[PDB]
Amino acid sequence: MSSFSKAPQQWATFARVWYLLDGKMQPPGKLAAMASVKLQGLHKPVYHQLSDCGDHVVIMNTRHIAFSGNKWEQKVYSSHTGYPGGFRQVTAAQLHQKDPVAIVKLAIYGMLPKNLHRRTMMQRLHLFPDEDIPEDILKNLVEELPQ
Amino acid sequence: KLHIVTRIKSTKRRPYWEKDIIKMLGLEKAHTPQVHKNIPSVNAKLKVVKHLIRIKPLK
Amino acid sequence: XXXXXXXXXXXXXXXXXXXXXXXXXXXXXXXXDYHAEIQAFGHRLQETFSLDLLKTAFVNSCYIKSEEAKRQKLGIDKEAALLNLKDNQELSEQGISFSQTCLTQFFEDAFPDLPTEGVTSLVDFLTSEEVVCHVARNLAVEQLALSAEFPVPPPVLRQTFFAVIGALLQSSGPERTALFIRDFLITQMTGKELFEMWTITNPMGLLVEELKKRKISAPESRLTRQSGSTTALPVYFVGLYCDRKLIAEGPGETVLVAEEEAARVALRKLFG
Amino acid sequence: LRSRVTDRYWRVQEVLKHARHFRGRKNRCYRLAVRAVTRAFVKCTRARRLKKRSLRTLWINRITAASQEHGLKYPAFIINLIKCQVELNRKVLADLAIYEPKTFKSLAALAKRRRXXXXXXXX
RNA sequence: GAUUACCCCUUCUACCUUUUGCAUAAUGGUUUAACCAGAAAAAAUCUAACAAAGAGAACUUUAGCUAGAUACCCCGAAACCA
RNA sequence: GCCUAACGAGCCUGGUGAUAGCUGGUUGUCCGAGAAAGAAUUUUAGUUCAACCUUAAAAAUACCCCAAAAAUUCCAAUGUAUUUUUAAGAGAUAGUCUAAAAAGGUACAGCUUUUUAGAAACGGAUACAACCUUGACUAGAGAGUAAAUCUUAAUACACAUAAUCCCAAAAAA
């Protein structure tokens, strides 16, 4: 083919590939790392920062996640409002008993770089406490990497 | 035999007399090797700045 | 002095809102003579002969008609430039014919496995007006071209270019021409467009014709797998085979487009 | 006696000519144009200095990706390439990591071969 | 810098003045135009004239003497006197 | 208090461009070299020569310096380059911190008063004057490294707006 005068290689953009990640005892935040790698598209040799070539990751069985140590009761999630004394402390236990899909999502929410692309790639992430996937009627690729 | 002196560390932040020693060894730059004869006069100065340099015997 | 710079700035600022048309006679700053141009033309290119035919090659009928028109209008004197056009049209005629023959020989020798339809298509694309005229303008032939009305329009530069061709055919013979043209045209193509304009109508059916003509085997399309995406485009994996042997495989957004691309890749695959 | 004449006006005209495409008074006023021009040149130098760093990091990321596809990480691949006496730059290596998976697959195969031979010779 | 004929992402703590140190929440400025603040040769260095003499009736002179060329910016009081 | 809207002594004009060691200011390019404290002063926010520095020439030699000897004061040798002599000309003299040794203070201070040393890209330390790495040509879609970045230490028959000692997590070459 042809190449001219010192240029980086990117053509236009491509289509993202949807991936599936299993639950059941994989460490929280340890999965969020590689899920953020797949979210950014760092696993693809064609990766570009501005192009946002990141894929769409779907994880299942988020309630079956297992955190080691005593961190179950000892982890405190802080939620503060505009009102004075609106500081709220929610333990990982109670949060798991209420809204588990939030936990892992938060573990991902700190991994990604800031500003736009964070929320942009955040919309590419979906979590469910139990397995129901109408999106599985649509054939997708499954990747298995347990810890 | 003959000893070759190489500068692996800066003379900056160090006393001026050490810089004078390095100038005596003929090192104007880091990592630059210099061939020198073995004598107590040179060996002493070599022992002064030894912590700032690496010396290897050759030839 | 500030007056000369204010006048230069005012002229340079006046040329922004006013654009004058390009003139052929006032184009070159130095005096333009026939011998100077043909001399440089002889020094640059390998071999150049028939200076009269070369000068005639850059002569167009419009300039002659305009000249004779001015001769009739003013009525001062009368001269005959008539022979120029009559000598040019013949060179152009032979030029076109020999160009067709030469290019046909090129496509015949280079790609023997290319079907007649492909040969016709590639010849039609290679002899196309727009491309050749583009090569002309890129070679700055318009500077050597003589046109009274306007320098720009393609019917001038194209006929002029073909006249130059025929001139090289008569003067320098075929052996030199084959060196000249063959170098440029190939370098100009560079694209997939060559087989794309022939694929504009029923790619599948064309592949059917080629396969039935060569191996006498009906092509079969079979979906080997599907990876769906509801948001942007779904991806279907389409295989294309003959006699259980897979010819090609490829992804597509829709079944139609997938089959089109598969048929295209398979089309260029059988080109060799 | 001299005069201000066209000198200052021409200098301002030049600075403002270089101040085009700028936002607001900086593409209009002279002083802000100069102030923005200085910053523009400093940023030119600095970004032209860090461009190599950004490209290097990007290439390292790409090669890391292509390597991880083959089961090995970036540092191991680098070490193996060093002991293979390969001076190939990471730019061309990334270009091969994109367009020509076969060459990178061969280099990765030789990498795993050298690693297995070293691990078998050490034992 | 990349990128599309526009933008998001990434890389960066205004200028000046005053200071050990200012993006500093120290100082001055709405913007633009214009106005606006280093002009003194003794000894010296240097370029030439002549040389125990130079220099246009005056001075210097154990190589001098004569000539030319080189370095020391503005605004502001409270008050005093007639 | 008042004496033409402000009187510890009116206003106008002139002396007058009064005096200001103060404060606020002082405009084109490129190249080389490049300063933070010795004693005095009706002096400390200013000056005068040393401690330095710069220009242009000459005659010298100088330093790092071991045993003869009294942390140094001296001197071979070493590998070095400089050290002045003379001729003109500057500016600077209200500075800090760390490390070490001191003094005052309370084995307080981003504390003060001295001696020695270092110090002041845009790498590292989250950002940040000295701490760590490095001495400073332009250009280049090259390469090799320096420091650094994420963790290590435990058992008994208490301040005041929203959290974590820089994200999220992790584990115990």
CA angle C25, C30, C31 (to 5 degrees): 60
Strand E-contacting residues in D 58-117, CB cut-off 7 angstroms? none
Q: How many CA atoms lie within 13 A of C102 on its CB side?
A: 22
Pairing of strands A18-21, A56-59: parallel
- Distance, in Å, from the CA atom of C102 to the CA atom of A106, rounded to the nearest integer, reads 71
- Distance, in Å, from the CA atom of C136 to the CA atom of C142, rounded to the nearest integer, reads 7
D18 burial type by CB count under 10 A (0-12 exposed, 13-18 middle, 19+ buried): middle
Largest CA distance in chain D: 93
Chains near D (3 or more Cβ pairs under 8 Å): A, C
With CA atoms as reference, the chain A residue closest to D61 would be A42
User: What long-range pairs does D110-118 form, CB within 8 A, spacing at least 24?
Assistant: D110/D80, D110/D84, D111/D72, D111/D76, D111/D77, D111/D80, D111/D81, D111/D84, D112/D70, D112/D71, D112/D72, D114/D80, D114/D83, D114/D84, D115/D72, D115/D76, D115/D80
Q: Locate tokens 């993202």: which residue?
A: A16
CB C170 within 8 A of CB C53: yes
CB A104 within 8 A of CB A31: yes
Nearest CA among C29, C31, C37, C27 for reference residue C59? C37
Q: Cα–Cα distances in Å, from C263 out to C37, C222, C237? A: 51, 13, 13
CB C77 within 8 A of CB C161: no
- Distance, in Å, from the CA atom of C50 to the CA atom of D86, rounded to the nearest integer, reads 59
CB C238 within 8 A of CB C259: yes
Cβ of residue D15 lies below 7 Å from strand E: no
Q: What secondary structure, in 3-state letters, does C182-223 show? A: HHHHHHHHCCCHHHHCCCCCCHHHHHHHHHHHHCCCCCEEEE
Nearest CA among C180, C198, C199, C193 for reference residue C103? C180
Largest CA distance in chain B: 33
User: What long-range pairs does B30-39 form, CB within 8 A, spacing at least 24?
Assistant: B31/B6, B31/B7, B32/B6, B32/B7, B33/B4, B33/B5, B33/B6, B34/B4, B34/B5, B34/B6, B35/B2, B35/B3, B35/B4, B35/B59, B36/B2, B36/B3, B36/B4, B36/B5, B37/B2, B37/B3, B38/B1, B38/B2, B38/B3
Say if the Cβ atoms of C226 and A18 lie within 8 Å: no
Sequence-separated (6 or more) residues with CB below 8 Å from residue A79: A87, A88, A90
CB D26 within 8 A of CB D33: yes
CB D25 within 8 A of CB D39: no
CB A26 within 8 A of CB A35: no
- Distance, in Å, from the CA atom of A2 to the CA atom of C213, rounded to the nearest integer, reads 35
- Could you tell me which residues are beta bridge partners of residue C241? C220, C246
D7 Cα to chain C: minimum distance (Å): 10
Say if the Cβ atoms of C5 and D5 lie within 8 Å: no
Question: How many Å is the Cα radius of gyration of chain D?
Answer: 26
E1 nearest neighbour residue (CA to C1') = D47
- Distance, in Å, from the CA atom of C157 to the CA atom of C142, rounded to the nearest integer, reads 6
Helix (H) or strand (E) holding B4: strand B2-6
Q: Cα–Cα distances in Å, from C62 out to C34, C81, C82, C130? A: 19, 12, 12, 21
Q: Cα–Cα distances in Å, from D116 out to A112, D11, D65, D79, D113? A: 36, 69, 22, 13, 5
Nearest CA among C199, C145, C166, C198 for reference residue C94? C166
Q: Cα–Cα distances in Å, from B39 out to B47, B50, B52? A: 12, 15, 20
Question: How many Å is the Cα radius of gyration of chain A?
Answer: 18
- Distance, in Å, from the CA atom of A136 to the CA atom of A142, rounded to the nearest integer, reads 10
The DSSP result for chain D, as a single string, is: ----TTHHHHHHHHHHHHTTT--GGGGTSHHHHHHHHHHHHHHHHHHHHHHHHHHHHHHHHHHHHHHHTTT--HHHHHHHHHHTT----HHHHHHHHHH-HHHHHHHHHHHHHHHHHHHHHH-
Question: How many Å is the Cα radius of gyration of chain C?
Answer: 27
Å between CA of D1 and C1' of F89: 33
Quick one: tokens of A125?
């992430």
Nearest nt (C1') from B30 Cα? F134
Torsional class of D85: left (φ above 0), alpha (ψ -120 to 50), beta (otherwise): left
The DSSP result for C58-105, as a single string, is: TB-HHHHHHHHHHHHHH-S-----HHHHHHHHHHHHHHHHHHHHHHHH
- Give the count of beta carbons closer than 10 Å to the beta carbon of residue D105: 14
Strand F-contacting residues in B 15-54, CB cut-off 7 angstroms? 15-17, 20-21, 23-26, 29-30, 36-37, 39-42, 44-45, 48
CB C100 within 8 A of CB C181: no
Q: Give the number of beta-carbon pairs within 8 Å between A and C.
A: 19
Nearest CA among A41, A36, A50 for reference residue D54? A50
Question: How many Å is the Cα radius of gyration of chain B?
Answer: 10
- Distance, in Å, from the CA atom of A104 to the CA atom of A126, rounded to the nearest integer, reads 10
CB A95 within 8 A of CB A103: yes
Instruction: Tell how many helices (H) and how many strands (E) occur in chain B.
Output: 2, 3
- Distance, in Å, from the CA atom of A114 to the CA atom of A116, rounded to the nearest integer, reads 7
Å between CA of A75 and C1' of F161: 23
A11 Cα to chain D: minimum distance (Å): 12
Q: Locate tokens 């080109």: which residue?
A: C271
Q: How many CA atoms lie within 13 A of D102 on its CB side?
A: 1
Task: Give the CATH superfamily of A2-147.
Answer: Ribosomal protein L13 (3.90.1180.10)
C219 burial type by CB count under 10 A (0-12 exposed, 13-18 middle, 19+ buried): buried
Pairing of strands A141-142, B34-37: unpaired
- Distance, in Å, from the CA atom of C191 to the CA atom of B50, rounded to the nearest integer, reads 66
Sequence-separated (6 or more) residues with CB below 8 Å from residue D74: D60, D63, D64, D67, D68
What sign for the dihedral angle of Cα A58, A63, A64, A69? positive
- Distance, in Å, from the CA atom of C128 to the CA atom of C154, rounded to the nearest integer, reads 12
CB A21 within 8 A of CB A146: no
